[PDB]
Amino acid sequence: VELWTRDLGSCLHGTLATALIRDGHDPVTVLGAPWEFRRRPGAWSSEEYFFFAEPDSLAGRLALYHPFESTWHRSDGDGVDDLREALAAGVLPIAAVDNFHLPFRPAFHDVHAAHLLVVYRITETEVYVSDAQPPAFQGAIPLADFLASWGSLNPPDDADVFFSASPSGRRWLRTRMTGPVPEPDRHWVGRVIRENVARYRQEPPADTQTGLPGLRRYLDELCALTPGTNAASEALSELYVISWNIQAQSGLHAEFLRAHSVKWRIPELAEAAAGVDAVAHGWTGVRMTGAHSRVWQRHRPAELRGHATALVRRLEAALDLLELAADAVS
Amino acid sequence: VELWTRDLGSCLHGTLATALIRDGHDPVTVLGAPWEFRRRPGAWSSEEYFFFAEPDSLAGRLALYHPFESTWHRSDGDGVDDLREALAAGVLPIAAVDNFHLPFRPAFHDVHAAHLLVVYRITETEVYVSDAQPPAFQGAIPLADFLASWGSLNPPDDADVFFSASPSGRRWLRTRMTGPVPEPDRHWVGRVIRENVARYRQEPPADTQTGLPGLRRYLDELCALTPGTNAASEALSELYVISWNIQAQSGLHAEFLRAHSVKWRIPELAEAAAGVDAVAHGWTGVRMTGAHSRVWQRHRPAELRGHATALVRRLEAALDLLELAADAVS
Amino acid sequence: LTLPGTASAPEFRLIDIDGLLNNRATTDVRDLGSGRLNAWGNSFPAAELPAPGSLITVAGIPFTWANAHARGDNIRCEGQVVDIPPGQYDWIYLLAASERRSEDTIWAHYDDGHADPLRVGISDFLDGTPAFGELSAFRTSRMHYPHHVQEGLPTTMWLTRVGMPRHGVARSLRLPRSVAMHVFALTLRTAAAVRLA
Amino acid sequence: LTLPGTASAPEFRLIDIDGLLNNRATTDVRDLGSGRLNAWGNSFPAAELPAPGSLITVAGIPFTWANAHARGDNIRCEGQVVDIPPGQYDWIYLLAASERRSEDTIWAHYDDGHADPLRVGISDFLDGTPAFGELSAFRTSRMHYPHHVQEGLPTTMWLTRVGMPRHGVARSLRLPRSVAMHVFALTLRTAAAVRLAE
Ligand SMILES: [Mg+2]
Ligand SMILES: [Mg+2]
Ligand SMILES: [Mg+2]
Fold it and tell me: Do C156 and C136 form a contact (C-beta atoms < 8 A)?
C-alpha cells in the first residue's frame, strides 16, 4: 500500500493514486493525462475531494482517458463488515472521514473537515488506514476512532467554512480498471493533448462553465459580486473548494508532460509543462486572495481581478504551447 | 534646426520633432504622450511617413494632446518660390522627397523610397536640408538635386515594394502650434494615460480597426490570407508600412513614461514603460516576419500567428500596467 | 572549447525590511493563535528559525534575520517598493515561502527610468518540493496550528535567486503582488568584473 | 548592512554553433548581394569583424568566431535547440543583433524535465541604442548594401547576458522563434560558489 501525493494535491488524487499503484498502474499517466476546467452552479459540496464528474463517475472523470471507474457506497449498520468484505475481494476501500475524529490528523478534536483515506486491513479491534496528506500516516487506529470518523456528522465549523457541514455518512469509494490501460505511446500522448486543448477551446452550451470560455465567465461572475455580502462569501467558499482539485490536476498534467519530455527527449513537452505549471501557479493567486477575503475579511477585489485575468492569460499561453507539443509527438 | 530621431522612428516623427524643437517644444512630451492603434482598410499609401490621421491633420493626430496641426501643399511650377516664401514667413517646410534623388542618402540612384526631410534655408543655387534618419545629414544640396527629389515620379521599384510607386508631387507639410501647450504635470500625465487606455479598450467601428479589439481583428484578417498570394503580398506591404509609425509611437510613448518616472521618482511609470516597450518590440516580431515573407518568400504562417498573438497579449498586459501608473499620478 | 575565468569579490547588501513587516508567519508556543502564514492560521515554529536580528548565511549568502514585532515578522507581498543603495547588481536573493507554490514578478527600477520585470517562483511552506530550483533555507520538523504544535510536519522556507541582466544603476525593487507570497529576508549581490584567468 | 563576498573562478564554455549557421548577416565587397541581415539585404562589413574560427574577448568574455560557409555566418533565430555541455550555469552570453530592437524567450532545458523561459532583449543592428543595458560588442564605421559599401553608417552588434537562476543541470537551450534576431556567438558561464568572505 503506497503513500502518494503532491504539494498541490488533495486526498482525492492521493487515495486514487494508492488504489491505481496497487493494481500496477502509473498514477502520473492515469490522473495526469486529463486537464480541464468545469464549474456547475450548485454542484459543489463542502468536501476536500469535490470534483465535478457528471456524467462520468468520480474516478472516471479524473482518469478520462483510462477505463477507470468508481461507485459510491453507503454502509448500513454501525460496524465495518462491508469494508471487511471489500478487502477480502481485493478492493482498497476509500472511506469518507472527518479529520476531527482521526487521532493522527492535526485537526484531531480541533477542526471538522470532510476528507478521504485508504483502508487496507481490519482486525477485531483496529482499522489500518493509509493517508499521504501531510503529515503522512500508515497503520492501525482503534476501531472506535475509525467508526467515529466514518460516521461523523461533520457539523458546520467556524474554523472550517470550506470542508465542514458534509457528513461522512459511512460513504466509501470502490474503484476498478474495467479493462487493460491504453498504451501511453507518442501517438496516444498527442491525441490526449489535442483532446484537452479542443475541450478547453470549446464554448460551453448551457449553465455548466467549461474550458477557457467557461473560466473567463466564472471569474467575471465571481469578481462582479460585492465583497462582504452572503452571495460573495458563498462564491469564495465554492472557489476555494472546486479550485483545489482543478489546481491539483494542472500540477499533475505538468508533471505528466515533464515525464514524457525526459523519456522521449522532446523539448516541446517540457516547454508545454512550464505553460501548464504557470496555470497551476496562477490558481494560487486566485485561490489564496479568495481564501484571505473569505476567512479574514481581507477584501481585495482589485488583487482578485488581477490574479483572475493573469490565470486566463496563462491558460491561453499554455494551450498554444500544448499544440506545439502535440505537433512534436505526433 | 536640430537633428532628432529614434532607432524605431521614421522621417515622420523625426521631421515633426525638428519643427517642434525650433518652436521650443519637447518632442518626447508632444509626440510621446499619444499612444493608439488604428487601421482603415484602403487608407495606406506606399510612403515611409504614412499614419492614419482622419479626422485630425497628420501632425494633429501624432500630437493628439497638443494644439499642433499640419496642412499638406502641392507646389505648382518648376522652382522653390513657395518654399522661399514659407521660410521668409518663419515656416519650416517638411518636403515629400524620393531618396533615389538625394545625394546624401544610401539609396541615391539605387532605390526609390517616399521620404520626408526639413528645408531650413534656400539660396539661388542650393537648398539646405536636415535629415536625421541614419546616416544623418544637415547642409546644402544643389537646387537641381532637391527639385529632382521633390518632383520625382517615385516609380514602382522591385527593390522597394513598401515605399515606391508614390510620386513626391512637390508636396510639403506646414506645421504650427496654434495655442499654448498644456503643463505636463502629474494630473496631465494621468489623464493622457487614462485617455490612451480608454481609447485602446473601446470596441471599434465596423470600418476602422482601432485599439485592442481592432488589433485582434486586423491580425486575425492578416493571418487568414494564404502566404505567397497577391492578396497576402498586398496585406504584408500594408503591414510593414502602417506598423513603422505605430511601432515608432510605441517606442516614443515608452520613452515619455520613462522620462516622467525619472522626473517624479514614480516606479509605476517605469513599469508601464516596460509594458509599452514590449508592444514596441512585439511589432518587430510581426512586421519583420511579414517583411521576409513579402520580399524573400520566407513563408512562416505559424511564426506570424505566434508574433501576432504575443503582440496582443503584450498590449493586454501594458494596458493593465498603465492603469496602475495613472492611479500613481492622479 | 572550455576556458578558465576569474571574477573579483562582489559586495552583499543586506536590506533592512523591518519597516515593511506586515504579517505574522512565525509563532512561539505562547502565541500559537497569532499565526497568519495561511488562511488556517498556521505558522513556522520560532524555536526552529534564527534569533531575530541575527546574521545568518544560507548556501553562503548572508541575510539579516528580521527584528519582528507583535504584528509583523515577514513581508506578505503586496507590490511594496524597496529602496536599495544605488549600484550595479547581478543577483537578488530572497528567503521566502508561498501558500502553495506560485510565480510572480520582482521589478528592478534603474536611474535612467527603465524597469525590468524579473520572474520569481516561490515554493510551498507546507512540506514543499522546490518547483523553481530553489535551495532549502529552513525545513522545520514541526508546524504551529492555532491551538497546538504539530509534530512530524515540516514547514519549508526557500532561498530563491533572481538575475539582474541590465548593465545599469538600480535604485529600488518592487516585491510581488501576491498575498500567497512571504519574504523573510532580502540580500542583493553587486556586479563583479569577470575575465579570462 | 554591506558585507564582502569572495572572488570566484567560473568557467567559460564557448558553444560551437557552426552546424546551426542558416543566414548571411556579413559580406565582403565581392558578395554584397548575399547580405541577408535584414529584408533590405544589408550586412555587417567582414573587414571590420574578427576572422572566422578566431578566439576573441568582448568586455572580458571569451567567444569563438563562427567558421562561416557561403550560406551561413550566424544563427537567424527559428527556435533552434542548442545542446550545451551538462552543468550548473549562472549566465548565457550572446553576441547578437536584431532587425529593430526586440525581446523574446531563450528556453533553458534541465535534466529533470523542467524548462525555464528566460527573457532576452536584443538591440538594433542599424546604428542601434542599447535598450536592455547590453554592452557594445562591435560598432563598425560602415554598412554593406546589396550594391555598395555605405561610409559613415555604423552596424552595431551587442553583448547580451541572460541569467539561469535554477539550481539544476541544464542540457540544452532553445533560441527565440524570431527572424528579426541574429546570434553570432554563444558562451555559457558555469556556476561558482560566492559566499560571505571568511
Ligand atoms: Mg471513462
Ligand atoms: Mg488636435
Ligand atoms: Mg499624487
Answer: yes
What CATH number does residue A231 fall under?
1.20.120
What subunits touch chain D, counting only 3 or more CB pairs under 8 A?
A, B, C
For residues D101 and D123, is the Cβ–Cβ distance under 8 A? Answer: yes
CA–CA gap between residue C62 and residue C64 (Å, rounded): 7
Judge whether B142 is closer than 8 Å to chain C, CB to CB. no
Asked whether A51 and A241 are in contact (CB, 8 A), the reply is no
Which residue do the cell numbers 500522448 mark? A189
Compute the distance from residue B328 Cα to the ligand 3 centre, in Å: 6
Which of these, B62, B309, B277, lies nearest to B173 by C-alpha position?
B62
Report yes or no: B240 and B259 within 8 Å, Cβ to Cβ.
no
Closest Cα in chain B to C116: B274
Of A306, A309, A320, which has the smallest distance from its Cβ to B309's Cβ? A320
**Within a domain: residue D7?**
no
Domain span at D73: 12-190
Q: Residue D96: which of D188, D173, D183, D35 has the closest Cα?
A: D183
Cis peptide before D10 (omega within 30 of 0): no
Experimental method: X-ray
How far is the alpha carbon of D175 from chain A, nearest alpha carbon, in Å?
12
Are the Cβ atoms of C2 and D12 closer than 8 angstroms? yes
The domain that holds B45 is classified in CATH as 3.90.70.10
Quick check: is A74 in a domain? yes
Cell 515594394, residue located: B161
Spell out the residues 6+ positions from residue B214 whose beta carbon is closer than 8 angstroms to its own: B37, B38, B39, B204, B208
Task: Check A274 against D115: CB less than 8 A apart.
Answer: yes
The number of distinct structural domains making up chain A is 2
According to DSSP, the β-strands at D177-190 and D11-14 are antiparallel
